[PDB]
Design a protein around this nucleic acid. Structure first.
Ligand SMILES: [Mg+2]
Ligand SMILES: [Mg+2]
Ligand SMILES: [Mg+2]
Ligand SMILES: [Mg+2]
Ligand SMILES: [Mg+2]
Ligand SMILES: [Mg+2]
Ligand SMILES: [Mg+2]
Ligand SMILES: [Mg+2]
Ligand SMILES: [Mg+2]
Ligand SMILES: [Mg+2]
Ligand SMILES: [Mg+2]
Ligand SMILES: [Mg+2]
Ligand SMILES: [Mg+2]
Ligand SMILES: [Mg+2]
Ligand SMILES: [Mg+2]
Ligand SMILES: [Mg+2]
Ligand SMILES: [Mg+2]
Ligand SMILES: [Mg+2]
Ligand SMILES: [Mg+2]
Ligand SMILES: [Mg+2]
Ligand SMILES: [Mg+2]
Ligand SMILES: [Mg+2]
Ligand SMILES: [Mg+2]
Ligand SMILES: [Mg+2]
Ligand SMILES: [Mg+2]
Ligand SMILES: [Mg+2]
Ligand SMILES: [Mg+2]
Ligand SMILES: [Mg+2]
Ligand SMILES: [Mg+2]
Ligand SMILES: [Mg+2]
Ligand SMILES: [Mg+2]
Ligand SMILES: [Mg+2]
Ligand SMILES: [Mg+2]
Ligand SMILES: [Mg+2]
Ligand SMILES: [Mg+2]
Ligand SMILES: [Mg+2]
Ligand SMILES: [Mg+2]
Ligand SMILES: [Mg+2]
Ligand SMILES: [Mg+2]
Ligand SMILES: [Mg+2]
Ligand SMILES: [Mg+2]
Ligand SMILES: [Zn+2]
Lengths: 52, 134, 122, 86, 50, 52
RNA sequence: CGCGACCUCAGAUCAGACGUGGCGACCCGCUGAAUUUAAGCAUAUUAGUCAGCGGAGGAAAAGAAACUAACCAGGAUUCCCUCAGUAACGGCGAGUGAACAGGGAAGAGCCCAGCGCCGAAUCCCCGCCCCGCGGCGGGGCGCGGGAAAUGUGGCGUACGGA
RNA sequence: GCUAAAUACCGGCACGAGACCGAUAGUCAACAAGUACCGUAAGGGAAAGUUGAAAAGAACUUUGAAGAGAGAGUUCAAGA
RNA sequence: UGGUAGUAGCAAAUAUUCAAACGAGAACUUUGAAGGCCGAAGUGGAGAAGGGUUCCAUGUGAACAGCAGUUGAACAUGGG
RNA sequence: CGACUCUUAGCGGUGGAUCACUCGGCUCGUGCGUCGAUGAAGAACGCAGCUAGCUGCGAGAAUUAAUGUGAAUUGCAGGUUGAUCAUCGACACUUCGAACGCACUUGCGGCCCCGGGUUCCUCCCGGGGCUACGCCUGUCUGAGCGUCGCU
């Protein structure tokens, strides 16, 4: 039952989307993990450039 | 504040680790402070309580200056029993009253081969700590 | 008195056996005393005798297996119980020698073009 | 006679205790277990009963050998080495 | 049934030995909350299965 | 087995065994009746092994 | 008739090994609906989803173009943003719905068959000796046994090679 | 035909934390819980925390067979 | 947790009576006597299936055996 | 007056509501990321001086040996040259269970080697070690009016 005026919408929520949803609560932890691995790589190749 | 991420600050976990600690950890937990003479002699602030140490009582109904020897260390109840710190029951038999080691000051240590080396190690650790301070 | 394992290892096999059977006899008669009904001394001593029997059997088994693996120390095929009992996946894993085997192609490739140590000025 | 009177003929059991699962579901006439399928070499397990799966899992029983393997892992499965004697 | 099998008789043996009451000295323990044996079985109420 | 019981009793107590009758008690343990040879006396054997 | 090879197939409580099953959150392969929506319902939708079966690992799979592009061209696979709720599919109804380029995380390339060239220059097993052996290996001695010419090993693979 | 890296993790081991829940809540389960208990079976599946700082858990007297009262006593408090 | 409510009911298969004993307490236990029933296709004596210690002895009478119990197939000890 | 019924208050009976406690959950995140024929997961049965459940353990059965620590465990008895706990690398780990001599009553076997009988003469008893399917390499025994060479 659409209202008086407004857009027509076709949301893609008809599947069971709740069963497969990814949350970014580990985003800062993954950033730290990438940073530590990057620094560990950098100190592993002592004179070589960090960027490769 | 604590900075080690591998040491708990949660009340529930600390209580669980205290009330479910094994006996060899109960011994270290149930430690009593040494007297002023003992600490100025052996340079040790506190020691675990033992079976045959002469101690006093600092806090409680039985506090005073009288000196009594421990008779047993009931580590299951976090309790030690003293030579004459006891009360009578209804039938008249006398049973000792449990006293926590925290409110017990050791007057004379029943020093042994292991007790002496523990004191020497603790004194050595605190001496190198003080030297490192300055 | 209180039998301990320190002075049991030096004992020879026959002496350990002729002590074990006496321990068995004492345990059996202590069991008989328990069934009939006696003092608590025998009841308490039952546990002591059982542990003493266990300790004697442990020493005998340790010496026997130590001698066996000493015998099989240098041989190529050794019995399964003597073989190292690690995880099944680890046992099926390739050994260090096989995994370190390198074909002549990559051997000479690393010879001709080794990984160099370089740096770049800012 | 469909009900109470019919219940009076219960005198020959259908299932017996299984020798693998331990539950009383080993069908005698079928010679198969309705709880774990003893003759079948594969343990009966279905994903439409999560509770049934959870009632008997790896962590349910004693873990007689697995818990030993868990404490051996933290040392890397050492073999042939002993702590130095006094 | 008088023609009991060995496994069934052994199973009944364990159940009978489990059916005994709790000794009176246990409930004097410090960390004790066992006021009685709640898993007692009676031959007229619970039929033990089988 | 009955043979094992007979041999064990003979070795442990140096007494000849006439026959053995075994039953399994409702508690699970096996009760064994060991009938001795006519020469030996059960009363003497019992009072010398402890049971009296 | 017999003897001796090769080839196909048997029997071994033969010597030495391996697979069986379980957990299964994550992953790979297959099979796979109906509830529901479409205000009914048959195509569609739910949906390559649930259920079912098989197989692992610490990650798996994928992976170094029979690629993307049509530009002054980029250059393995994988993941985030974006492209985009777009191109497009749809009783063109309800609804479904990518990919290229771009910015980042990471970044690592390679090996055979084939064509050829080198006395099969190759490999496995058992006996003996020495060394360390609780990831059974290295050196030496066996006119010891075997695999292999119906093709092992060295050079060498689309970026050329000899 | 091979190949780590960046990637996924409601199973498992050991951890840290929370603007969450506070015993009809939160996992079904804070306790001898997938236990007791029901169904032949597949399966279903609970209720149930709070003595006191310390048992110091009420000596002893009295009526009654006892349950249980009346005194007395412990405890700051048996109005724990 | 109330009214119902100290209510419905404790009415299928003829039936109990007397004296004593234990016991604190007896319509209900035991003994003895009398009167009865099942009437050999039994209310008898023994099995199979099924139940699994219900079998035996002693003690208790806290709870259950829709009254009560000195009794129990109840509870606790030991046998078998 | 009385009895009964109704309203309020005090006190006394249920009943555990509220409140305060929480060795428990839920969620997020981190590191690790390991089962099994040398017998996994699971199940059964046993093991304590007094022990039912739980927990732990496997005939060495609420544990053995070793290391660390150092004077207890405790509801009741009993007895520093190392009690109790923790760690755990040595030893051991009953019966079923992929379960493995055949089927699942725990019955029936077969082969080899020892100890009781014998004094290997055959039985019998006890003990020890093997006897599951598939499949790789090698070895042995072989089969084929399959392909052959010789007589
Ligand atoms: Mg409207
Ligand atoms: Mg980069
Ligand atoms: Mg610190
Ligand atoms: Mg090559
Ligand atoms: Mg049938
Ligand atoms: Mg399956
Ligand atoms: Mg073989
Ligand atoms: Mg598998
Ligand atoms: Mg519709
Ligand atoms: Mg509709
Ligand atoms: Mg319709
Ligand atoms: Mg379609
Ligand atoms: Mg489709
Ligand atoms: Mg498909
Ligand atoms: Mg599925
Ligand atoms: Mg891969
Ligand atoms: Mg290419
Ligand atoms: Mg791409
Ligand atoms: Mg679609
Ligand atoms: Mg792109
Ligand atoms: Mg070639
Ligand atoms: Mg690949
Ligand atoms: Mg934080
Ligand atoms: Mg509650
Ligand atoms: Mg509450
Ligand atoms: Mg709850
Ligand atoms: Mg409640
Ligand atoms: Mg309460
Ligand atoms: Mg409450
Ligand atoms: Mg008050
Ligand atoms: Mg209060
Ligand atoms: Mg009436
Ligand atoms: Mg009637
Ligand atoms: Mg009869
Ligand atoms: Mg009776
Ligand atoms: Mg009554
Ligand atoms: Mg794994
Ligand atoms: Mg027991
Ligand atoms: Mg020891
Ligand atoms: Mg030690
Ligand atoms: Mg049969
Ligand atoms: Zn089963």
């Amino acid at each position: 039952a659409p209202s008086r005026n407004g857009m027509i919408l076709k949301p893609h929520f008809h599947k069971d989307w709740q069963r497969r949803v990814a949350t970014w609560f580990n985003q800062p932890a993954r950033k730290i993990r990438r940073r530590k691995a990057r620094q560990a790589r950098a100190r592993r190749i002592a004179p070589r450039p960090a960027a490769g | 504040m604590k900075f080690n991420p591998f040491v708990t600050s949660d009340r529930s976990k600390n209580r669980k680790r205290h009330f479910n600690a094994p006996s060899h950890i109960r011994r270290k937990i149930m430690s009593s402070p040494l007297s002023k003479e003992l600490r100025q002699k052996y340079n040790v602030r506190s020691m675990p309580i033992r079976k045959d140490d002469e101690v006093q009582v600092v806090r409680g109904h039985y506090k005073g200056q009288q000196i009594g020897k421990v008779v047993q260390v009931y580590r299951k109840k976090y309790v030690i029993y003293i030579e004459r710190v006891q009360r009578e029951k209804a039938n008249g038999t006398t049973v000792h009253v449990g006293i926590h080691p925290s409110k017990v000051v050791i007057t004379r240590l029943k020093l042994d081969k292991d007790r002496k080396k523990i004191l020497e190690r603790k004194a050595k650790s605190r001496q190198v700590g003080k030297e490192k301070g300055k | 008195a209180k039998i301990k394992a320190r002075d049991l290892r030096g004992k020879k096999k026959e002496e350990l056996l002729k002590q074990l059977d006496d321990l068995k006899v004492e345990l059996s008669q202590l069991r008989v005393a328990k069934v009939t009904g006696g003092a608590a001394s025998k009841l308490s001593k039952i546990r002591v005798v059982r542990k003493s029997i266990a300790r004697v059997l442990t020493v005998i088994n340790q010496t026997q297996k130590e001698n066996l693996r000493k015998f099989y120390k240098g041989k190529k095929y050794k019995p399964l119980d003597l073989r190292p009992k690690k995880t099944r996946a680890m046992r099926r894993r390739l050994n260090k020698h096989e995994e370190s085997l390198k074909t002549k192609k990559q051997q000479r490739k690393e010879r001709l073009y080794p990984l160099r140590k370089y740096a770049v000025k800012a | 006679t469909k009900g109470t009177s019919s219940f009076g003929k219960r005198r020959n059991k259908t299932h017996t205790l299984c020798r693998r699962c331990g539950s009383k579901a080993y069908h005698l006439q079928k010679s198969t277990c309705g709880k774990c399928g003893y003759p079948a070499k594969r343990k009966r397990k279905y994903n439409w009963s999560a509770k049934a799966k959870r009632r008997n899992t790896t962590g349910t029983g004693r873990m007689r050998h697995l818990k030993i393997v868990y404490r051996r892992f933290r040392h890397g499965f050492r073999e042939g080495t002993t702590p130095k004697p006094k | 049934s008088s023609h009991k099998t060995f496994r069934i008789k052994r199973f009944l043996a364990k159940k009978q030995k489990q059916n005994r009451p709790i000794p009176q000295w246990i409930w004097m323990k410090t960390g004790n909350k066992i006021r009685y044996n709640s898993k007692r079985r009676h031959w007229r109420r619970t039929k033990l299965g089988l | 087995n009955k043979h094992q019981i007979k041999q064990a009793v003979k070795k442990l107590y140096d007494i000849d065994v006439a026959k053995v009758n075994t039953l399994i008690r409702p508690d699970g343990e096996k009760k064994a009746y060991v009938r001795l040879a006519p020469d030996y006396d059960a009363l003497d054997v019992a009072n010398k092994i402890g049971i009296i």
